[PDB]
Design a protein around this nucleic acid. Structure first.
Ligand SMILES: [Mg+2]
Ligand SMILES: [Mg+2]
Ligand SMILES: [Mg+2]
Ligand SMILES: [Mg+2]
Ligand SMILES: [Mg+2]
Ligand SMILES: [Mg+2]
Ligand SMILES: [Mg+2]
Ligand SMILES: [Mg+2]
Ligand SMILES: [Mg+2]
Ligand SMILES: [Mg+2]
Ligand SMILES: [Mg+2]
Ligand SMILES: [Mg+2]
Ligand SMILES: [Mg+2]
Ligand SMILES: [Mg+2]
Ligand SMILES: [Mg+2]
Ligand SMILES: [Mg+2]
Ligand SMILES: [Mg+2]
Ligand SMILES: [Mg+2]
Ligand SMILES: [Mg+2]
Ligand SMILES: [Mg+2]
Ligand SMILES: [Mg+2]
Ligand SMILES: [Mg+2]
Ligand SMILES: [Mg+2]
Ligand SMILES: [Mg+2]
Ligand SMILES: [Mg+2]
Ligand SMILES: [Mg+2]
Ligand SMILES: [Mg+2]
Ligand SMILES: [Mg+2]
Ligand SMILES: [Mg+2]
Ligand SMILES: [Mg+2]
Ligand SMILES: [Mg+2]
Ligand SMILES: [Mg+2]
Ligand SMILES: [Mg+2]
Ligand SMILES: [Mg+2]
Ligand SMILES: [Mg+2]
Ligand SMILES: [Mg+2]
Lengths: 156, 100, 146, 124, 54, 114
RNA sequence: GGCAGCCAACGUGUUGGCUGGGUAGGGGAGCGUCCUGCAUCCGGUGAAGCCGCCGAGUGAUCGAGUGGUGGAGGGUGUGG
RNA sequence: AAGUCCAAGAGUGCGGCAGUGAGACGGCGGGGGAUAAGCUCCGUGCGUCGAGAGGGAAACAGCCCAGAUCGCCGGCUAAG
RNA sequence: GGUGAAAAGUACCCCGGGAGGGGAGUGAAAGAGUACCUGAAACCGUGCGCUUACAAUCCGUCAGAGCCCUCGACGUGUCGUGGGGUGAUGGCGUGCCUUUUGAAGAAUGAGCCUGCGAGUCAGGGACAUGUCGCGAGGUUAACCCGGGUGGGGUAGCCGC
């Protein structure tokens, strides 16, 4: 009611009019008045402990591993020319499930571009691996370099 | 002839062929049930002694289990804010009288 | 379900009560019972299944004590100071039937049904009545012992 | 997430107004007035379901009394005599006999009167 | 003095029903050979051609 | 059932209650008798009502081929149209509202055997 | 004859005993609405909304039961 | 010392969340008042109302009877 | 603020001074006609069924005659494990909210409907209580590096 345009003046006299007393044309009960306890911009992020986040990711990856949903590959495609057709065929040989998380190193632009356009495929780097994307995927496909990079940064 | 039959803490005047709704009994439909009697009237003569009434029983066949009317309760007292809504449907059994 | 009267079910009869030497209140209570139909096993409070009652010799009704001079029937006309009173003695001389009538009406329910029941009461000062065509049954006021 | 109230709000209104069909004036037409009457209506209904049992018993007793007195016995002595004879017919059916089978009722009156003490007004 | 309460639907309608027109009684007149209907009050004028039979 | 024709006059600048007052004189009557009654009725709303009845009779003849003599006014009613709002200044600054009411008038005429 | 709370007795949820008026007020368990992660299903062979019918639950209420109107979205499960 | 003891849903201690802190009448013991008030101020393991429906008292918060889990067109009683 | 996919926005005829409407056309639809998507409620009509002019009514409730409608079996109407509408007549019956020792109250608030209108959010805040991780240890702040929700960061803080 303080941010709405106008509303500074007391509309009419306190007594004698026969109407309910009002302090502002922008009081909440007025049409066009201020909002009470309405939304205000707020940050929703939480300060989840590091150990909880890591353990959750390990749990998710272990669930895939036990169900044999983790695959390893040298490259998604051969050469330096992106080709979605090659990657789609190759991924079809690996998994027939709809959603697939592909974990590739930063440098493998041609692999990333080659899979990017496929509908259920999500691409991530191994340093960005997170519980939500693992649990959302039916299968996790690792580049050998990315899998080794993940194992090294953790198990060392 | 007709009899006054006891069932479910209540009494019903019934003759052969009468259909009566009574309190729920544990029997399947098609089962026959045997019920005690408070009075028998065979035309002119009235059977009323407890000794002779113990001799006699009415036979009825369970037709179906059914639900009575939906009762809606809305308890209320003014100037209190006290409201208590409640519903009820009594379980009933329908009997067809076969003999006396 | 409990028996309920239907369209054709109610059968009237005609009774005649000789009020001679009968106590007013006793006569009136008995007549009210018959008019209401309390003596019939088919009685239903929302139905008038009463019988017709003829009272004869309503001038020979008996009243005890000094009520003949000290009991007053009161009427108010609705105008200020419009309250008039008559003793039962004076009312018996001028309007013999009114005494018995008022007694019985005051023992009937004060509702619409009661007004319909009042239709069936006929009261006459003399020993005679015009209703021989209905062949009224003489009714004596008895008491069932217990 | 701004929520408009109409969808949820209208449901209870339709229920109350359906229940108030047949009421007169504002009580059939306006939700607020029909709601008020519904409070009374369901209170009355609850109360009268309880009272109904007494009201029917009152009717049966009156009918039994008329039939008893037509057989030269008062109601109170009839009930006493039926108890002494051990006849367990309740008043609902006693009234149905009084209406639908006067002969059977008369036979019950004879049973009751026989089982009465010789001197009803004697000690014990 | 002001109305103390709102008036019931029934009470309003009962009074409001008294606000109504009554039909005029009409009589036939032959004018220009055709038979027209006019109030008896205007019978003489209609024969004299003083009424505008539209 | 009878063969029928309809006419409507919508947004007629007359209150529905004042129209009804006239309409109550002609409901159920033959079209000839209705137009006679309306001709001599002193009420102003008689004229709009007359026009609708005549228009419905004309539709019955020219569109449906019914004979005018058999036509009766079976159903007629007036409904309220839009109300325009005006203000009438009163004493000591009071401003009161004035309602300029309108009505819709519906007539159905039936060809009935005499 | 149906429901519920506390406790007991045993059983892989039923039996029994006791108890169940209630304002301020405390505790517990739910209904309906919208927006969303994920998973599923329905929809120009007619979604929502609205008006009815016939029914349903102990209550908020329900109808993936059906007519009419209508014209493009909606339901369900589990979480936020 | 026993009783109650599938509970009075009792006491005691600590902690979370309260509300309340205008009371009324009736019985009994008293002050103030004129041994007046439907008065006023206290006491009472006294009651009811408050927060209590049902029956009685013609009607009638505070009196008498009795504490409403729901259903029944069964039965017995309380005050009256 | 919303016609419709498209203006194809209704040629022509009929009643009318017009307004408006009825035929005829356009359209999948005019139950889309520039008053236009859907079209609730208050509020206002018309038609049909039952009821009501001897009656004292918080407007209802529980009994309930009579009439009307409908679903079953039988036959010409009549009965049922029925269901609806209306309701003569009988019993019972002092609105809702607020605020009070106590209000149907002749105390306060509300003419009616629809829509709107009140314990919310921020902070390594404080106390308590669930839940999850780690555990004699637990945890990072700023900040740094990732197009993210991820990784790093020991200064601190709280236990000892
Ligand atoms: Mg500005
Ligand atoms: Mg300001
Ligand atoms: Mg100010
Ligand atoms: Mg605003
Ligand atoms: Mg971090
Ligand atoms: Mg109170
Ligand atoms: Mg009882
Ligand atoms: Mg001026
Ligand atoms: Mg149990
Ligand atoms: Mg409770
Ligand atoms: Mg209790
Ligand atoms: Mg509370
Ligand atoms: Mg929904
Ligand atoms: Mg289509
Ligand atoms: Mg939606
Ligand atoms: Mg939720
Ligand atoms: Mg204080
Ligand atoms: Mg104090
Ligand atoms: Mg005190
Ligand atoms: Mg005092
Ligand atoms: Mg109490
Ligand atoms: Mg009480
Ligand atoms: Mg007894
Ligand atoms: Mg006693
Ligand atoms: Mg359409
Ligand atoms: Mg419009
Ligand atoms: Mg529209
Ligand atoms: Mg009459
Ligand atoms: Mg009276
Ligand atoms: Mg009364
Ligand atoms: Mg006061
Ligand atoms: Mg209080
Ligand atoms: Mg008031
Ligand atoms: Mg008043
Ligand atoms: Mg005040
Ligand atoms: Mg006011």
């Amino acid at each position: 009611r303080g941010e709405v345009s106008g509303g500074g003046k007391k509309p009419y006299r306190q007594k004698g009019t026969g109407r309910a007393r009002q302090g502002s044309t922008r009081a909440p009960q007025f049409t066009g008045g201020g909002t009470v306890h309405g939304p205000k911009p707020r940050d929703y992020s939480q300060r989840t402990p590091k150990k909880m986040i890591a353990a959750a990711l390990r749990g998710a990856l272990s669930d895939r591993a036990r169900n044999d949903r983790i695959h390893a590959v040298t490259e998604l495609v051969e050469g330096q020319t992106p080709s979605t057709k090659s990657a789609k065929t190759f991924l079809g040989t690996l998994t027939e499930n709809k959603k697939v998380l592909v974990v590739i190193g930063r440098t493998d632009e041609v692999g990333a571009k080659s899979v990017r356009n496929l509908p259920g495929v999500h691409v991530i780097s191994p340093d960005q691996l997170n519980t939500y994307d693992v649990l959302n995927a039916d299968d996790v496909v690792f580049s050998v370099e990315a899998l080794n990079a993940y194992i090294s940064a953790n198990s060392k | 002839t007709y009899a006054i039959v006891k069932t479910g803490g209540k009494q019903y005047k019934v003759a052969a062929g009468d259909v009566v709704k009574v309190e729920k009994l544990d029997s399947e439909p098609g089962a026959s049930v045997s019920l005690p009697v408070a009075l028998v009237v065979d035309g002119a003569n009235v059977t009323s002694k407890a000794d002779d009434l113990a001799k006699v029983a009415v036979t009825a066949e369970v037709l179906e289990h059914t639900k009575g009317p939906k009762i809606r309760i809305h308890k209320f007292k003014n100037k209190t804010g006290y409201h208590k809504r409640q519903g009820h449907r009594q379980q009933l059994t329908v009997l067809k009288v076969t003999g006396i | 379900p409990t028996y309920t009267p239907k369209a054709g079910d109610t059968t009237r009869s005609w009774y005649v009560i000789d009020a001679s030497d009968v106590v007013l209140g006793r006569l009136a209570s008995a007549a009210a019972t018959l008019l209401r139909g309390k003596h019939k096993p088919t009685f239903t409070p929302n139905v008038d299944g009463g019988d017709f009652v003829i009272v004869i010799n309503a001038d020979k009704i008996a009243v005890s004590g000094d009520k003949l001079t000290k009991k007053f029937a009161y009427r108010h006309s609705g105008y200020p100071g419009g309250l008039r009173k008559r003793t039962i003695g004076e009312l018996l001389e001028k309007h013999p039937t009114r005494v018995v009538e008022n007694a019985i009406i005051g023992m009937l329910p004060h509702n619409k049904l009661g007004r319909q029941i009042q239709k069936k009461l006929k009261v006459y000062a003399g020993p005679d009545h015009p209703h021989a065509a209905q062949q009224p049954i003489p009714f004596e006021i008895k008491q069932v012992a217990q | 997430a701004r929520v408009k109230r109409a969808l949820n709000a209208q449901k209870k209104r339709r229920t109350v107004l359906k229940a108030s069909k047949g009421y007169r004036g504002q009580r059939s037409r306006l939700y607020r007035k029909a709601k008020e009457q519904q409070l009374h209506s369901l209170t009355y209904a609850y109360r009268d379901r309880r009272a109904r049992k007494g009201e029917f018993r009152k009717l049966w007793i009156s009918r039994i009394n008329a039939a008893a007195r037509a057989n030269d016995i008062t109601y109170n002595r009839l009930i006493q005599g039926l108890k002494a004879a051990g006849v367990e017919v309740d008043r609902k059916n006693l009234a149905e006999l009084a209406v639908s089978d006067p002969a059977a009722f008369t036979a019950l009156v004879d049973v009751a009167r026989a089982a009465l003490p010789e001197d009803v007004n004697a000690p014990s | 003095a002001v109305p103390k309460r709102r008036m019931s639907r029934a009470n309003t309608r009962s009074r409001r029903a008294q606000w109504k027109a009554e039909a005029p009684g009409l009589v036939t007149v032959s004018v220009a050979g055709q038979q027209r209907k006019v109030p008896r009050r205007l019978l003489k004028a209609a024969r004299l051609g003083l009424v505008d039979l539209d | 059932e009878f063969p029928s024709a309809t006419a409507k006059a919508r947004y007629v600048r007359v209150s529905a209650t004042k129209a009804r007052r006239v309409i109550d004189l002609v409901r159920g009557k033959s079209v000839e008798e209705a137009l006679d009654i309306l001709r001599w009725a002193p009420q102003a709303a008689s004229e709009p009502v007359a026009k609708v009845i005549a228009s419905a009779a004309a539709n019955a003849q020219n569109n449906e081929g019914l004979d005018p003599s058999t036509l009766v006014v079976a159903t007629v009613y007036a409904d309220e149209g839009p109300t325009a709002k005006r203000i009438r200044p009163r004493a000591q600054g009071r401003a009161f509202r004035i309602r300029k009411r309108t009505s819709h008038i519906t007539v159905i005429v039936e060809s009935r055997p005499p």
